[PDB]
Ligand binder design. Structure first.
Ligand SMILES: C=C[C@@H]1C[C@]1(NC(=O)[C@@H]1C[C@@H](Oc2nccc3cc(OC)ccc23)CN1C(=O)[C@@H](NC(=O)OC(C)(C)C)C(C)(C)C)C(=O)NS(=O)(=O)C1CC1
Ligand SMILES: [Zn+2]
Length: 188
């Protein structure tokens, strides 16, 4: 089946919030047909297959997410299932042409090390960047709370895209840091 948009994380106001646009059955039906006519908007989508839910983020006109979420699946669209335009399984990165109605986050030109991770729960978590693909959590979270948030953006103070959340750094059974795909690698 296809990956289906089932919600979004709205980042337009000073406070992020999640919006659900499809329920469980609708998700499963839409995955099977690959036909999705729902209006798209915003930069961060909540996406789901029959068995996994995670995030997708539009940057550079491409809707990006993680391979360990989407596999090589098509995404449901107004015209039926659409094949991936980008697939790098080793980087854990896939992408489709962004849906009409979506907006892309602008890649960060700040070089800021003060980052913010956007989760599927709309928790925007402070993160200190340490390297090209790593930053430390500045507020404690369990691995379990971050699960389902892969594919979500790391933002800089200005709301620019710094990276895509790929994996959590687990130390002594809790989330200590995040591993992310740098926006510089999201080349079209
Ligand atoms: C808590 C949340 C994290 C963000 C989240 N990602 C994970 O669960 C990821 C998935 C898997 O990693 C990787 N797979 C494939 C290729 C990879 C290529 C890489 O690089 C090219 C690096 C990692 C890779 C294991 N993993 C970890 O994060 C693991 N961490 C990990 O591997 O950390 C390293 C990378 C520092 C070793 C962990 C924490 C399970 C032990 C998530 O929410 N997923 S999800 O639930 O949405 C789900 C799609 C449905
Ligand atoms: Zn910036």
């Amino acid at each position: 089946g296809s990956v289906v948009i089932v919600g979004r994380i709205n980042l337009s106001g000073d406070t992020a919030y999640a919006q659900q646009t499809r329920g469980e059955e609708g998700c499963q039906e839409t995955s099977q047909t690959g036909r999705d006519k729902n209006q798209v908007e915003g930069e961060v989508q909540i996406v789901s297959t029959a068995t996994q839910t995670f995030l997708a983020t539009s940057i550079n006109g491409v809707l990006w997410t993680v391979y360990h979420g989407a596999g090589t699946r098509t995404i449901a669209s107004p015209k039926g299932p659409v094949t991936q335009m980008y697939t790098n399984v080793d980087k854990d990165l896939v992408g489709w042409q962004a849906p009409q109605g979506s907006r892309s986050l602008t890649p960060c030109t700040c070089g800021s090390s003060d980052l913010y991770l956007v989760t599927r729960h709309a928790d925007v978590i402070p993160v200190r960047r340490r390297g090209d693909s790593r930053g430390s959590l500045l507020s404690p979270r369990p691995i379990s709370y971050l699960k389902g948030s892969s594919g979500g953006p790391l933002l800089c103070p200005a709301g620019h895209a710094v990276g895509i959340f790929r994996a959590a750094v687990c130390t002594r059974g809790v989330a200590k840091a995040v591993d992310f795909i740098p926006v510089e690698s999201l080349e079209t």
